[PDB]
Amino acid sequence: PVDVSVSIFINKIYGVNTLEQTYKVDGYIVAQWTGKPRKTPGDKPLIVENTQIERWINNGLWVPALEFINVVGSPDTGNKRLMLFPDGRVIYNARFLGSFSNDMDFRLFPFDRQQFVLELEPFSYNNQQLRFSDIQVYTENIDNEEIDEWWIRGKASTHISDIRYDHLSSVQPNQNEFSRITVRIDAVRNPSYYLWSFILPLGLIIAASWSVFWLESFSERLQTSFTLMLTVVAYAFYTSNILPRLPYTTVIDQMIIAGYGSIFAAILLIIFAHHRQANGVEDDLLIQRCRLAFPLGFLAIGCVLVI
Amino acid sequence: PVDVSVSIFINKIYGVNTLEQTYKVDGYIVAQWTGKPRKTPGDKPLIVENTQIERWINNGLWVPALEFINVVGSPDTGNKRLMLFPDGRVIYNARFLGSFSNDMDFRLFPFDRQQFVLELEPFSYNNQQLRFSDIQVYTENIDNEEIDEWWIRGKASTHISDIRYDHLSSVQPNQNEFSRITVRIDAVRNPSYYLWSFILPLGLIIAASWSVFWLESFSERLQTSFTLMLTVVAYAFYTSNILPRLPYTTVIDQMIIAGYGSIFAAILLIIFAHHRQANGVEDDLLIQRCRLAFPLGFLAIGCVLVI
Amino acid sequence: PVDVSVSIFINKIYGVNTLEQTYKVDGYIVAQWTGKPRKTPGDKPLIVENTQIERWINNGLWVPALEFINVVGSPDTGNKRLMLFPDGRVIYNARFLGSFSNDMDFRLFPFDRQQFVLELEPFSYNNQQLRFSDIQVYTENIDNEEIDEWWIRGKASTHISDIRYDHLSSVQPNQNEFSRITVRIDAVRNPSYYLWSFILPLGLIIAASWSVFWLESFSERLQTSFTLMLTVVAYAFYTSNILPRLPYTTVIDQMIIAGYGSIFAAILLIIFAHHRQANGVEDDLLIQRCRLAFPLGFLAIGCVLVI
């Protein structure tokens, strides 16, 4: 098995589409291996640009096709370069732009911690024909930066493993294990924008739904409650596009449900206060003085639901 | 007829666009057949990468073009590999990303049960020239997983049939039957997000439209009703993008119509209560105590309409 | 002029974008003509797959390029096949996905009746060099089906005509007429979704604007009217994306204008009622009992405007 030394330089990461859980990676890949010696004009290495590598591959030069496992379709490969040496070593440099998909878990949407994963693998040659010796990733352009809403922390973790494929077991009996390179970049989401745009007004409206009971009239308090519920409906569609449809509830959705439940609890308390008048002449004092105990109970509810 | 053994490995399914009823499938296809023996350098099989298969096809190697029947346009084929053996067998491996369309029935939108269908067929060679022996599908990557909002249940059902085409009957008199492979993956939609985001507040507003009659003033009750109807209008456009335009009504649309009908019934009951005053001095008691019978009747209506 | 027999098989029609009046057609085309006899290996026809036709065209085989007149740019041609016979006949089969544009008239938006038109023409050879003998269209996949919101009725009408081009008259003096094939598929829109989603609540709000006059207070009736007008504004943007900007008014837009006019007429009637008090002590009876004549007049207005 020929040994290939890979080096990935991550130029930038952007386009983090949290809806489809794909992110765009732009960068360069430098694969390097050693082959049989060849005659090169002069005592200098020979550089072969793009759309000129095809003549060398047609003549019979062994250039492996390294694909990305977790890419969406095909990467938009820009330029490629093949640098050949007289002693036998080959260096294949290429530039890639790819849409990569990783399993993202948005259980804590604003304070999220994800990792961007690049999985690289030979498409044809298995570990008995191609072995990845080492990979070192130079993510120095975005080592400690803020790309769009994500802080990149530290360096990029690298791993080299062997993947056994069962769909190639019927066509290749024993030799179906492929050498795979995994590159993980840990990123934390910047929670500032959601903190001052999607959490603070929701807290203000929750406190307003707390304050609806300070009136002394039933029907005007009801129209107040319904205008508040229309405002919670307004944030229902103001905050719908920022996240996909997940079975669990994040903090934003928990606060939206908290607003709905607070308005419904207010309406039920008003109705029971109207029903509490046994003869229609007795007023309400204790059930109308819940303007301070309901904030305490709802603060306890929020403290449970956030953690 | 040469016998071709196909093996499809579904790497991932995503991008389930319920509006156009297309889904994106990424995976690999391994077709395998047996041809006439050829001389290969050494006692090892020969691997031909992408854009090098074209030289073999120009020299005269028989490589069938397997197309997808239900694909949108053309798949974004990435790498392809042709592995040739001295005893005569040929293995064509390829990677595909495709937008596939299937007839989806959204009569039960949140609790939906669909199936993703891959239909594969030779474009040129009929069943007298190319016969699919068997297909076994390894959907092990997504065998029991949750891709975006869908649970994949069990394995993938496979079927091999013969399709008779009438447009090729005029050009091919008797031999126009094509061997087709059908792969069906049964998926169930995760109904959680719609349950806590699109159903529960609609139930709260339906109960609120029940509770509008607890006031003792006509005009303020009317403005309450109109603010509620504006809120139902707010969910009219808050829930419009999640589903195409279908002749039938799903649960979400049935609840939206239920909210509209409940507000209109409330307005008609208020107006008939105002019309019930024969001399303008008699009040309303029975028609104003419908705050409990109307919930019962509307619960019966909802129990009928959901089932 | 060589005679070409065309056969179009419409696999599916979808993506009917009423805004730009384009629709996506997926299908197959089978052109067939007769040429000079050639020697074929064996006593069987020879099948040439895609990217292998180019060698035959370079060697000198006459394969006409049939283009689509009403296509948006270029179709996404998938596979193509060229089947050659020893007696001389050539059959060119191809698969196309195209965005086609037709002049659509949305004067009756929900109850619309459009036709999808495929116009096919040789790009280079005129009627003195290429003549279309006949076309028969097998739209059996969607003969009587519901694609997205359209019922396809009957079979597909076909026509063969000759088009004289004036831009080629300066370069070709007399021979500039091209044989054209036109295929028309008549489709009717399913009006159910707009009936229970875009028409019924508008009728309910029109009846509500009828019912605004049942109050006995001027200012609360005014705020009722303004909340209703805000609801009509809510349907202004709830129903804006479903149709392009046309000079005429459809039923949905006529009902939106009806709602605006009904609210404005209500406001003017309230203001004239306030102005009708000559001394400020006389009340209003006839102008305040218009809660039944205004529905009759507006029903007559709607009966005129729908038809």
Add this chain to the structure above:
Amino acid sequence: PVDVSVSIFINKIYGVNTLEQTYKVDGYIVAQWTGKPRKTPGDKPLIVENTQIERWINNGLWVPALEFINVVGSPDTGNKRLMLFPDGRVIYNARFLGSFSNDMDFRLFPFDRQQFVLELEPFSYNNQQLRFSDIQVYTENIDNEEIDEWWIRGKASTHISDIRYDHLSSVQPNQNEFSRITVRIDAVRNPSYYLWSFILPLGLIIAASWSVFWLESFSERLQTSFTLMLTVVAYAFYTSNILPRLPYTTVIDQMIIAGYGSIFAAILLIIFAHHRQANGVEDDLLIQRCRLAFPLGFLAIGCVLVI
């Protein structure tokens, strides 16, 4: 300099994206020039289809590359045809779909008058090597039609000029002037849709903000004013997508600002009326009878701002 006679046939114009000021043009181009005589099989001209012109260009046939100056990127060229004659004349016919950008001035958005400009130029050969003799444009398909919201008036004006480029002056000392063809098609926007959808309800709400002062209560008049201002906010986002962000104000934006200013003037007049009570017992008559002078002044304001 060889003389080239160009003829552009505009099949259709569509996709007028007023946000980015680009429009899609579909059509055909017929360039014609005269070269050295050549031997052609028979006494008939020879027609060379697409992907067969490349062999003639490789053999040494002079085919100029006419590019579009104001195109977005590259046009989607469909088929191309090269018709060669024995006497020496060459006719290059091609089909183009292009996104073209022109400097559009939306100072009068509904009653706009724009022009669609096609600028054609040789990419390599200057006026000393290639001269455009004449261009005549056959826009007969859309001569007097309504494409999407635009009326096309008259024929297409054509012009042939010489452009001197300063970036090629350093590489070409004196010969850097290129022959350019400019085609201008004057179009007027259909203002009907904006008239009955974006102007009339704004006038109704302006008249409603005029009518807010007919009440006799301060606070209810204030909530009336705030509901009206919320409605003007509703048209703020109902009419935001139809036009880009321009420094100047169009009629729609002037009416939106008129609505905002009318509501603010109403609020200030109410507040000054509340402040006009010196002892709290004197009422307001003149400042409360501004329900007719304010319409006159605002009509004068609108008459100034529209013109």
Add this chain to the structure above:
Amino acid sequence: PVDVSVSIFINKIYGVNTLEQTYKVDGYIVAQWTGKPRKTPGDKPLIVENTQIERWINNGLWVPALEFINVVGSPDTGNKRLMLFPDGRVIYNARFLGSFSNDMDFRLFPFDRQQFVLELEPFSYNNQQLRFSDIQVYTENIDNEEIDEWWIRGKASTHISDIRYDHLSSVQPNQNEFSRITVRIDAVRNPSYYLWSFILPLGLIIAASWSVFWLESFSERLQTSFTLMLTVVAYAFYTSNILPRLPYTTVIDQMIIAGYGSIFAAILLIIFAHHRQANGVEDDLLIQRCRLAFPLGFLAIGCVLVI
């Protein structure tokens, strides 16, 4: 090292997508270098069009591939031209359309000052093999113009530097420095549209939240406050699409937060006024006369937050 003289002509800049911080640049590039002398037919230079350069590169002509560092994927290169001279100089002209990304800082969103940066670099040849002598940029088409919402000021600054790459240090020990060209075009955003569309109504609503205290009733003042807060919620989604999610607050977002805080301060002041009644018979005068001091304090707050 061969010396290359580059000249970039910026035809237009458009599509400034502030969300992803990319802008589209259309233009031409003219690289020029001097090579070994060659024999050309006649005493005139030879012009090689697009898809004919490939034959010269296959024969062995040295044409460097200049890539754009900050481009999104690959530019849509249109035509290219290679002009060869008998004395040895080569001129490579090309047209590019590219999506370029630069680090944009939107701390002052309407009054923003950005710079569009074009970074050009050889993909293969380092500074010991390729050196950029000089670049002069002719941005005369957009020297002093308004493209979409940006004024371009002055000329384009140019710089030539050397970049040392650490990912190529392992494969190239000492010679890994690349000659880079940087072109910066300073642009200022036109702040007019945001001034009369996104700032002025926010100021009017802030003044309205100032004016809410002029009433003498608690509950109606509360519903007034809640309708105002619903209007601020309406601008929450009316102004969400114009800018990405940034950790800091711009002027528009600061005014939105100012509106939220003003409504919440109004609600707290009303509640404390209701709580200030010790026995329920004493009224409020000083806390109800804050209709003038609160504007002064909020004007001071706004004067601090804008600067």
